[PDB]
């Protein structure tokens, strides 16, 4: 976002958005396709004429079906396997961010290969090689277990998302304050 | 009182209770009398078997500094250090 | 004696040693001691042998720590009953005139 | 010292200034410094053994033999402060309660 | 990043200058720090206040005299040749158009990046009445730097003449957790993501912890071993008093 | 790409890659000599197995031995040969259980537990005091004005 610098017409904004669209197709770095939605990029351009590629891939992460997105696009961008490979990393990434607090309120960290199979549109045997390529490229740091089918990661790039996320973030800090009323008040009486 | 004591022998420790055997332990003539004793003692019932899930004990009013505490367990050791300090005081 | 030396042992092997009455009699006597945690074992009626449930390996547990915290105060028990006893005679000692 | 000089100096230099680390003050200096500080506590306890065994061996007869006085009190005060620091740091390792959970 | 070490004499003299000028809440005080910025740790060995005038109701009203800077800098050359201008400090919690525009004014006389300092005259909360801030651009962005208080050998000893453990760390650690609880609440009402990105990153830092339960009991095991040595401390005092008791019973006999 | 291939190589396409492109691989008349191509297949196959087990240990902490044999394109007698060679020569070290069929990374227990690994728990909460320091300055300027 820069008002004075880079003054271009309306036609060149959609042409620049086309370069911003094809930039994130072949890599997952710097958040995801939904990062440009919060910035005045997708909201400043029309939703048709193949300018919606950044918008459809955001909802495709939760749906997890390549055939739905491949039907709305052309053969040019659908013939590159890099787009299909690097899209699966972002689909599990949402499930990878669930390891801290999403559903379970006890902060229990467990990952089953069957939950991410339908989300990433990948079989169970290829899950071991999917997470293996993530460590080699420096995407995630952690260790995995093939025997118990358990994955534990340190962090990836926690997103700017809000709502139910920030609501659970406050609950974890309450446990820090709960020890003040439990363990903290006992030490003050000593 | 005899049947209640012999039943508690295989209750707490011994986990998964049989069907026809426990009838002979407590001297039951009818099999329907066996199920009547299970309802009063709250025995979990499964298919063709009777288990016991109550082995774990908790609650029982309040307990402090006894039976595997959590926050107070650390203060017990910390109290021993301040104990020798309070004597010199 | 026979339960600690023998982990997995059948039902009729005990009656042949101590010359007990029957198999139903020994089954009730073993289940009596497990109430207070004496034998610390289980009776499997399906397989028909008694197995000892004590695997030891309690060094990593907190059970020895309960005795450790008690023995910290046991040493301090003789400390508070002693230091006071030093000054107890010293009053009349220092009040008397010394050569 | 005026009213401003009283609050400023006590917040800057009084004995030694540990503040600004206040949550990590004794936490980082001890529990987070365990890399090498007290490391190999089993050897650290062996040090207290050699210090006590040396002076306790001097007079076991409670009389004049090796000509000494405070020998039993030398190892008493040295290993007392070390043990006091060994216990406080160890109990506060899990006492901070960082809430690790799983 | 870099580090900042401020001597206690600089902060002690900076607060009294606020009283010497009789500055009320409607105005703030601005001054210059002197030291060596060449190293990675910025140190302030000297400071002096400036007659800074400001209107609180108007952010476009400020008064900064550069003539006193040129004369004071020439006077310090005959005092200490190793002292140069590394930046400028200022008072007040707020950062407004007055303090941001003058940041480039001191840059003309300062070779390196001028070090920004927010000085709290009322000393409100925790420690560190003055925080170390560096100016950097991507809009003016002020990043915080670690601020340590360290003085010379005779400086720390001289202050002690003027003023002449376990529970302490716990009470100070609980105050940090309470400050975090209000940190997420005050920030939540401001939005309705940059800071939350760094917070959610360090939150994750008993599948792998199943074997990590024993290490808690391993340290508790040494504590009892230490208490065994701690008990020996008083076991000698148990022997030490009987060393007197044998001489105590020999007193009444001689009397 | 063949240099970085050792990381992701499953040895499934290994015979296919050498047949499609064979500049130095199968048929090479420059900087090489011999009576046949056996020196190309035997030397290359032994290396790609040794370079594969290096990255597998750095990624998989605990893996089933049955699944491990499928990745090496070997048998029970061939898999034990390359494992015993890397350990005896001081290359890598891992756990191999024949009856349990479980392969582990053999994590060292000499870290002295809380004497070292506890440094990771303080870095969990360490960055908070720094990020709060940046927020206090930024929050009051934007929200106040």
């Amino acid at each position: 976002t820069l008002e004075p610098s880079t003054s271009i017409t309306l036609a060149e904004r959609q042409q620049l958005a086309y370069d911003l669209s094809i930039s994130a197709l072949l890599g997952d770095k710097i958040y995801n396709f939904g990062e440009l939605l919060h910035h005045p990029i997708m909201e400043t351009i029309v939703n048709d004429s193949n300018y919606d590629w950044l918008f459809q891939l955001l909802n495709a992460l939760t749906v997890g079906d390549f055939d739905k997105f491949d039907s709305l696009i052309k053969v040019q961008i659908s013939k590159i396997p890099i787009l299909a490979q690097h899209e699966s990393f972002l689909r599990q990434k949402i499930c990878l961010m669930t390891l801290i607090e999403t559903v379970f309120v006890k902060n229990i960290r467990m990952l089953s290969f069957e939950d991410i199979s339908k989300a990433t549109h990948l079989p169970k045997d290829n899950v071991e090689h999917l997470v293996m390529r993530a460590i080699s490229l420096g995407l995630l740091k952690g260790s995995i277990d093939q025997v118990n089918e358990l994955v534990t990661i340190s962090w990836v790039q926690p997103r700017i998302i809000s709502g139910d996320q920030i609501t659970k973030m406050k609950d974890r800090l309450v446990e820090w304050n709960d020890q003040v009323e439990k363990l903290g008040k006992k030490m003050e009486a000593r | 009182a005899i049947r209640d004591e012999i039943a508690k022998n295989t209750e707490l420790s011994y986990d998964f209770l049989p069907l026809s055997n426990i009838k002979a332990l407590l001297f039951f003539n009818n099999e329907k009398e066996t199920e009547k004793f299970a309802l009063e003692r709250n025995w979990p019932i499964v298919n063709s078997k009777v288990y016991f899930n109550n082995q774990s004990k908790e609650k029982a009013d309040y307990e402090d500094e006894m039976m595997h505490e959590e926050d107070q367990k650390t203060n017990i050791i910390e109290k021993a250090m301040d104990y020798a300090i309070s004597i010199e005081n | 004696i026979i339960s600690l030396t023998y982990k997995k042992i059948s039902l009729r092997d005990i009656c042949l040693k101590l010359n007990l009455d029957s198999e139903q009699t020994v089954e009730y006597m073993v289940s009596r001691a497990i109430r207070d945690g004496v034998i610390e074992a289980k009776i499997n009626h399906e397989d028909g042998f008694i197995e000892t449930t004590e695997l030891l390996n309690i060094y990593d547990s907190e059970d020895p720590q309960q005795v450790f915290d008690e023995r910290i105060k046991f040493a301090n028990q003789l400390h508070d009953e002693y230091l006071v006893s030093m000054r107890y005679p010293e009053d009349k000692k220092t009040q008397q005139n010394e050569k | 010292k005026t009213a401003k000089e009283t609050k400023m100096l006590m917040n800057l230099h009084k004995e030694q200034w540990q503040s600004g680390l206040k949550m990590y003050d004794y936490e980082e200096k001890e529990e987070s410094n365990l890399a090498a500080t007290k490391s190999m506590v089993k050897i650290a306890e062996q040090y207290s053994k050699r210090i006590e065994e040396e002076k306790e061996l001097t007079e076991e007869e409670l009389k004049t033999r090796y000509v000494g006085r405070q020998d039993p009190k030398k190892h008493l005060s040295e290993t007392a402060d070390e043990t006091l620091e060994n216990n406080i740091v160890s109990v506060l390792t899990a006492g901070v309660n960082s809430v690790a959970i799983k | 990043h870099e580090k900042v070490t401020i001597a206690p004499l600089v902060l002690l003299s900076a607060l009294d200058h606020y009283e010497r000028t009789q500055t009320k809440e409607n105005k703030r005080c601005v001054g210059v720090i002197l030291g060596d910025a060449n190293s990675s740790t910025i140190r302030v060995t000297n400071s002096f206040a400036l007659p800074f005038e400001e209107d609180e109701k108007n952010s476009d009203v400020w008064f900064l005299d550069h003539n006193y800077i040129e004369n004071m800098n020439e006077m310090c050359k005959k005092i200490n040749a190793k002292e140069k201008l590394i930046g400028w400090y200022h008072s007040g919690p707020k950062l407004r158009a007055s303090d941001l525009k003058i940041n480039e004014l001191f840059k003309k006389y300062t070779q390196n990046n001028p070090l920004l300092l927010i000085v709290d005259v009322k000393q409100q909360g925790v420690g560190l009445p003055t925080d170390a801030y560096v100016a950097i651009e991507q809009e003016k962005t002020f990043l915080h730097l670690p601020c340590t208080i360290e003085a010379e050998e005779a400086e720390e000893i001289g202050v002690e003449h003027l003023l002449r453990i376990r529970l302490t760390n716990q009470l100070k650690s609980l105050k940090g957790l309470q400050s975090k609880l209000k940190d997420v609440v005050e920030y939540l009402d401001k939005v309705i993501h940059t800071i939350l990105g760094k917070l959610q990153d360090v939150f994750n830092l008993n599948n792998l912890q199943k074997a990590l339960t024993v290490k808690t009991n391993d340290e508790l095991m040494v504590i009892y071993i230490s208490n065994l040595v701690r008990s020996i401390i008083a076991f000698d005092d148990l022997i030490e008093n009987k060393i007197q008791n044998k001489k105590i019973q020999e007193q009444r006999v001689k009397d | 790409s063949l240099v970085k291939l050792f990381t992701t190589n499953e040895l499934m396409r290994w015979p296919i890659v050498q047949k499609t492109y064979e500049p130095v691989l199968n048929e090479d008349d420059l900087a090489f000599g011999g009576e046949a191509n056996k020196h190309h297949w035997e030397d290359l196959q032994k290396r790609v197995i040794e370079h594969n087990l290096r990255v597998i240990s750095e990624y998989y902490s605990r893996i089933t031995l049955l699944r491990l044999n499928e990745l090496l394109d070997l048998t029970e007698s061939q898999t034990e040969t390359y494992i015993s060679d890397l350990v005896n020569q001081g290359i890598i070290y891992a756990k191999v259980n024949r009856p349990a069929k479980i392969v582990n990374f053999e994590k060292p227990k000499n870290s002295s537990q809380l004497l070292n690994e506890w440094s990771h728990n303080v870095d969990e909460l360490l960055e908070h005091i720094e990020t709060i320091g940046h927020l206090i300055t930024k929050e009051e300027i934007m929200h106040g004005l």
Side-chain angles (χ1 to χ4, degrees):
Chain A
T1 59
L2 295 173
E3 295 302 321
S5 63
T6 305
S7 178
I8 59 173
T9 59
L10 178 63
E12 294 178 351
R13 293 182 182 175
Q14 294 178 336
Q15 294 178 336
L16 178 62
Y18 176 78
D19 290 344
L20 295 174
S21 178
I22 61 172
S23 62
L25 295 176
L26 276 68
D28 58 352
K29 293 177 179 177
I30 303 170
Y31 296 92
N32 62 344
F33 299 98
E35 183 67 15
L36 296 175
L37 177 63
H38 300 290
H39 297 166
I41 303 301
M42 292 300 294
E43 294 177 350
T44 59
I45 61 172
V46 68
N47 61 345
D48 61 10
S49 296
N50 290 336
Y51 294 95
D52 58 352
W53 294 355
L54 296 175
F55 177 80
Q56 294 300 321
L57 293 174
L58 177 62
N59 291 336
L61 297 175
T62 59
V63 176
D65 187 5
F66 296 98
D67 290 344
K68 293 177 179 178
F69 178 79
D70 290 344
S71 63
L72 296 175
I73 61 173
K74 294 177 179 177
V75 67
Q76 294 178 336
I77 61 172
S78 64
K79 63 182 178 181
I80 295 171
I82 296 171
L83 176 61
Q85 293 177 336
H86 295 167
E87 183 177 1
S88 63
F89 294 96
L90 294 174
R91 294 183 182 176
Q92 185 176 354
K93 182 181 178 182
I94 295 171
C95 296
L96 294 175
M97 293 178 70
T98 59
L99 273 65
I100 299 170
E101 56 186 343
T102 296
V103 176
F104 297 96
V105 297
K106 294 177 179 177
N107 296 131
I108 295 171
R109 181 170 295 104
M110 177 178 71
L111 178 62
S112 63
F113 296 162
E114 294 178 350
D115 290 344
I116 60 173
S117 178
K118 294 176 179 177
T120 59
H121 186 197
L122 294 174
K124 184 178 179 180
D125 290 344
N126 289 337
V127 175
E128 61 183 342
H129 301 290
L130 178 64
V131 64
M132 177 178 71
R133 294 182 182 175
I135 298 170
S136 63
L137 296 175
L139 296 175
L140 61 83
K141 294 181 181 297
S143 63
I144 61 173
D145 186 5
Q146 185 63 58
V147 176
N148 290 283
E149 296 177 351
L150 297 174
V151 176
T152 58
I153 61 173
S154 296
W155 55 275
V156 285
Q157 53 184 18
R159 293 174 296 180
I160 61 173
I161 58 174
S162 178
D164 290 344
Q165 294 299 321
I166 191 65
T167 300
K168 301 292 184 291
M169 290 176 68
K170 183 178 179 180
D171 290 344
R172 185 176 179 84
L173 274 65
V174 174
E175 294 178 350
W176 295 355
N177 191 30
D178 289 344
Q179 295 301 321
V180 177
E181 294 177 351
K182 294 177 179 177
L183 179 63
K185 292 177 179 177
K186 293 183 175 74
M187 293 178 181
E188 294 178 350
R190 300 290 182 268
Chain B
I2 295 171
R3 59 176 182 183
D4 289 344
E5 183 67 15
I6 186 169
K8 293 176 179 177
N9 292 337
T10 59
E11 183 178 2
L12 296 175
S13 178
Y14 177 75
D15 55 353
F16 299 161
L17 296 174
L19 295 175
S20 63
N21 290 282
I22 191 65
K23 182 174 178 290
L25 272 65
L26 277 67
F27 296 96
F28 292 160
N29 290 336
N30 290 336
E31 294 178 350
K32 294 177 179 177
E33 184 178 2
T34 301
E35 294 178 351
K36 294 177 179 177
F37 178 80
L39 296 175
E40 294 178 350
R41 296 287 293 174
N42 290 336
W43 292 356
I45 295 170
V46 296
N47 189 341
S48 296
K49 291 176 180 177
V50 175
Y51 298 147
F52 178 78
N53 290 336
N54 290 336
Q55 293 178 336
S56 178
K57 294 177 179 178
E58 62 184 343
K59 294 177 179 177
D61 290 344
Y62 296 140
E63 294 178 350
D64 290 344
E65 294 177 351
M66 66 175 284
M67 294 300 294
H68 182 62
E69 292 299 321
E70 183 179 2
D71 290 344
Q72 294 178 336
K73 183 178 179 180
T74 300
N75 290 336
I76 294 170
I77 296 171
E78 294 177 350
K79 183 178 179 180
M81 294 183 286
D82 290 344
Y83 176 78
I85 296 170
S86 296
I87 301 301
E88 294 177 351
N89 190 341
Chain C
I1 295 170
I2 188 168
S3 64
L4 295 175
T5 59
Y6 299 137
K7 182 178 179 180
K8 294 177 179 177
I9 186 168
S10 178
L11 178 62
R12 292 192 297 273
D13 290 344
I14 296 170
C15 296
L16 296 175
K17 183 180 172 63
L18 296 175
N19 290 283
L20 296 175
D21 290 344
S22 178
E23 295 84 357
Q24 295 296 101
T25 300
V26 63
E27 183 178 2
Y28 297 142
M29 294 185 286
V30 176
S31 296
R32 179 60 179 165
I34 61 173
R35 296 287 294 171
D36 291 344
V38 176
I39 303 301
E40 184 66 15
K42 62 180 180 296
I43 295 171
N44 297 131
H45 182 62
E46 295 84 357
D47 290 344
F49 60 87
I50 295 171
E51 182 179 2
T52 300
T53 59
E54 182 67 15
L55 295 175
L56 295 175
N57 296 131
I58 61 172
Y59 176 78
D60 291 344
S61 296
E62 71 281 4
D63 290 344
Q65 296 177 336
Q66 185 63 59
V67 178
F68 295 159
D69 290 344
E70 294 178 350
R71 294 183 180 277
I72 295 170
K73 294 177 179 177
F74 294 161
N76 290 336
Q77 183 64 260
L78 296 175
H79 299 165
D80 291 344
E81 295 177 351
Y82 174 77
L83 177 63
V84 178
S85 63
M86 176 180 72
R87 179 60 179 165
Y88 176 81
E90 292 179 351
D91 287 346
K92 294 177 179 178
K93 268 69 178 181
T94 59
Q95 293 177 336
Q96 294 177 336
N97 190 30
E98 294 178 351
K99 294 176 179 177
Chain D
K1 291 180 295 296
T2 59
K4 293 184 174 74
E5 294 178 351
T6 299
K7 294 177 179 177
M8 181 65 75
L9 294 175
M10 293 178 181
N11 290 337
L12 294 176
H13 184 62
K14 183 178 179 180
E15 295 177 351
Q16 185 64 59
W17 180 84
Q18 294 178 336
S19 64
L21 295 175
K22 294 177 179 178
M23 66 176 285
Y24 295 139
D25 185 5
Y26 294 92
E27 183 178 2
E28 183 178 2
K29 185 179 179 180
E30 296 301 321
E31 291 82 357
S32 297
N33 196 30
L34 292 175
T37 300
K38 295 180 181 297
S39 63
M40 295 301 294
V41 295
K42 295 175 181 177
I43 296 171
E45 295 301 321
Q46 185 63 59
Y47 296 141
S48 296
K49 181 174 177 290
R50 294 182 182 175
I51 295 170
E52 293 177 350
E53 183 178 2
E54 183 178 2
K55 301 292 184 291
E56 292 177 350
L57 179 63
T58 59
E59 298 302 321
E60 63 186 343
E61 296 301 321
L62 299 175
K63 63 181 179 181
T64 59
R65 181 177 181 172
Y66 295 142
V67 183
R69 300 289 183 268
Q70 63 180 19
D71 291 344
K73 293 177 179 177
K74 293 177 179 177
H75 62 79
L76 188 147
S77 63
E78 295 301 321
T79 58
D81 290 344
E82 294 178 351
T83 300
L84 177 63
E85 294 177 351
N86 290 336
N87 290 336
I88 294 171
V89 175
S90 296
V91 298
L92 294 175
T93 299
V96 177
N97 191 339
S98 63
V99 182
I101 312 301
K102 294 183 175 74
Chain E
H1 61 78
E2 294 178 350
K3 294 177 179 177
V4 174
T5 299
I6 295 171
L9 177 62
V10 176
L11 296 176
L12 178 63
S13 178
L15 177 62
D16 183 67
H17 297 166
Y18 176 78
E19 183 179 2
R20 292 181 181 174
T21 59
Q22 294 300 321
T23 299
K24 294 177 179 177
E25 294 178 350
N26 291 337
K27 295 176 179 177
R28 292 174 296 181
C29 183
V30 175
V32 176
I33 57 173
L34 276 67
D36 186 6
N38 290 337
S39 63
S40 63
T41 299
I42 295 171
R43 182 177 181 171
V44 175
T45 59
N46 190 341
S47 64
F48 58 90
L50 294 175
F52 178 80
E53 297 301 321
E54 183 180 2
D55 186 5
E56 183 178 2
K57 294 176 179 177
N58 190 341
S59 63
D60 290 343
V61 175
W62 62 88
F63 177 80
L64 177 63
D65 186 4
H66 62 286
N67 191 30
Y68 296 141
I69 297 170
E70 294 177 350
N71 290 336
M72 183 65 73
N73 191 30
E74 295 301 321
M75 297 298 103
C76 295
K77 294 177 179 178
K78 294 177 179 177
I79 295 171
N80 189 340
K82 294 177 179 177
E83 293 178 350
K84 63 182 178 181
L85 277 66
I86 59 173
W88 58 276
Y89 64 90
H90 64 80
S91 64
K94 293 177 179 178
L95 295 175
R96 296 177 64 185
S98 64
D99 290 344
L100 272 65
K101 301 299 182 181
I102 62 172
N103 191 30
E104 294 178 350
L105 296 176
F106 297 96
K107 184 178 179 180
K108 183 178 179 180
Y109 296 93
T110 300
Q111 294 177 336
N112 290 336
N113 189 340
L115 177 63
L116 188 146
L117 296 174
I118 292 176
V119 176
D120 186 5
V121 296
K122 294 177 179 177
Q123 294 177 336
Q124 294 300 321
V126 294
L128 295 175
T130 299
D131 290 344
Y133 295 133
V134 63
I136 186 169
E137 294 178 351
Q138 294 178 336
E139 183 178 2
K140 302 299 183 181
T141 299
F142 296 159
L143 296 175
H144 180 61
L145 296 175
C147 183
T148 59
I149 302 301
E150 183 178 2
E152 294 300 321
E153 294 178 350
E155 293 178 349
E156 294 178 351
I157 293 171
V159 177
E160 293 177 350
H161 182 62
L162 296 174
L163 295 174
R164 184 182 296 275
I165 295 170
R166 181 178 64 84
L167 178 63
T168 300
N169 190 30
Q170 295 297 101
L171 295 175
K172 293 177 179 177
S173 296
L174 296 175
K175 294 177 179 177
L177 296 175
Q178 294 177 336
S179 296
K180 295 175 180 177
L181 177 63
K182 294 176 179 177
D183 182 68
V184 63
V185 175
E186 293 177 351
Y187 177 78
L188 177 63
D189 291 344
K190 183 174 178 290
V191 176
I192 61 172
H193 61 78
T194 299
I195 303 301
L196 297 176
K198 294 177 179 177
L199 294 174
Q200 294 178 336
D201 180 67
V202 295
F203 292 160
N204 190 29
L205 177 63
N206 291 336
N207 292 336
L208 296 175
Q209 294 177 336
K210 183 178 179 180
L212 296 176
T213 301
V214 177
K215 65 182 179 181
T216 300
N217 290 336
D218 290 344
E219 295 301 321
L220 296 174
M221 182 65 72
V222 178
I223 295 171
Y224 176 77
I225 296 170
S226 296
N227 288 284
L228 177 63
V229 177
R230 178 60 179 165
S231 296
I232 294 170
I233 304 301
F235 291 162
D236 290 343
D237 290 343
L238 176 62
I239 296 170
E240 183 67 15
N241 293 337
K242 290 176 181 178
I243 297 170
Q244 295 300 321
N245 295 132
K246 62 189 183 70
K247 294 176 179 177
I248 293 169
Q249 294 300 321
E250 294 177 350
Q251 293 178 336
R252 292 184 182 175
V253 176
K254 294 177 179 178
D255 291 344
Chain F
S1 63
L2 296 175
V3 176
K4 294 176 179 177
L5 178 63
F6 296 159
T7 299
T8 59
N9 191 29
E10 296 177 351
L11 295 174
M12 296 297 103
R13 294 182 182 175
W14 181 88
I16 296 171
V17 176
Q18 63 180 19
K19 293 176 179 177
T20 300
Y21 296 94
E22 56 185 342
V24 296
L25 295 176
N26 190 340
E27 183 178 2
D28 187 5
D29 290 344
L30 296 175
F32 178 81
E35 294 177 351
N37 62 344
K38 294 177 179 177
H39 297 165
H40 299 289
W41 294 356
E42 294 177 350
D43 290 344
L44 177 62
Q45 186 174 355
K46 293 176 179 177
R47 299 291 183 269
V48 297
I49 294 171
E50 294 178 350
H51 299 292
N52 191 30
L53 273 65
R54 181 177 64 84
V55 296
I56 293 171
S57 64
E58 294 178 350
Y59 297 142
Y60 296 92
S61 63
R62 294 193 296 273
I63 186 169
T64 301
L65 188 146
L66 295 175
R67 179 60 179 165
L68 179 64
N69 290 337
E70 294 178 351
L71 296 175
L72 274 65
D73 189 5
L74 295 174
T75 59
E76 183 178 2
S77 296
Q78 294 300 321
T79 300
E80 63 184 342
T81 299
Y82 295 92
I83 294 171
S84 63
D85 290 344
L86 296 175
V87 176
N88 191 30
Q89 294 300 321
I91 303 301
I92 60 172
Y93 295 93
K95 293 178 178 177
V96 175
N97 290 282
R98 295 183 181 276
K101 294 176 179 177
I102 295 170
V103 176
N104 294 337
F105 177 78
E106 186 179 2
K107 183 178 179 180
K109 294 177 179 177
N110 290 336
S111 63
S112 296
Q113 293 88 3
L114 293 174
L115 295 176
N116 191 30
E117 296 301 321
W118 178 255
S119 63
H120 300 290
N121 290 282
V122 62
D123 290 344
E124 181 178 1
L125 297 175
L126 177 63
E127 296 301 321
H128 293 82
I129 186 169
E130 182 67 15
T131 58
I132 294 170
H134 300 291
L135 177 61
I136 294 171
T137 299
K138 183 178 179 180
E139 182 178 2
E140 294 178 350
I141 294 171
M142 295 300 294
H143 182 62
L145 296 175

